[model samples]
Target: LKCNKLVPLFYKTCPAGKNLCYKMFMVATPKVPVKRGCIDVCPKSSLLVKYVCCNTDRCN
Candidate 1:
């Protein structure tokens, strides 16, 4: 089996443990720097997003 896909993974920060969850499926547009953070937080955001494409299980 292979993991050739980009899944919407979840994560958390350090000991603070502030948790939130919502689905906003999107892809990084070509060119220019795009700031990624929670809409509720923005400049003072605690949420962060990252993308990874893999080709096998546990490929990350």
Candidate 2:
């Protein structure tokens, strides 16, 4: 898995044992900053934000 940010592009490998890739963004923000990374579990969504998870490589 890999991690991503809203600014400059940089590829970072995830730690071992983290099998899920996640992508999250703020729905209420004007800029809607995005975040992506690897996780062991996916968290619940909220009113102001949303997220998704996947198992494939770089799926976030």
Candidate 3:
């Protein structure tokens, strides 16, 4: 029998976050809440800027 190692089912989705990490702390809540869902595809770290949320996220 082979033993399987436990792993993260979802390491990271493609965008960054499914919802604002810090909404109230942002510039202001967006009229329509926009979320960047994960970024396992991101090759390098990047700076993200939005009407409400702005910060650097490690995507990769």
The better-scoring model by TM-score among 1 and 3 is 1
Query: Model 1, range 1-30, lDDT digits (tens) per residue?
Result: 222112324232212331222223224532
| Tens digit of per-residue lDDT, candidate 2, span 1-60 | 675534426546778888787778777763565777778889798897888778776556
Reference-based TM-score of each model: 0.19, 0.64, 0.18
**Candidates ranked by lDDT, best first?**
2, 3, 1
RMSD of each: 11.4, 2.7, 12.5
Question: Could you tally the backbone clashes for each prediction?
Answer: 0, 0, 5
- Name the better of 1 and 2 by lDDT: 2
lDDT, model 2: 0.70
* Candidate 3 lDDT (Cα, 0 to 1): 0.28
**Model 3 over residues 1-60: C-alpha lDDT tens digits?**
111112222233223343221221122443433343332222222344342232333221
List residue ranges in candidate 1 displaced over 4 A: 3-47
Best by TM-score: 2
- TM-score-based ranking: 2, 1, 3
Please report the candidate that would top lDDT against the real structure: 2
Backbone clashes in model 1, listed as residue pairs = none
In Å, residue 25's CA in model 3 sits off its true spot by 10
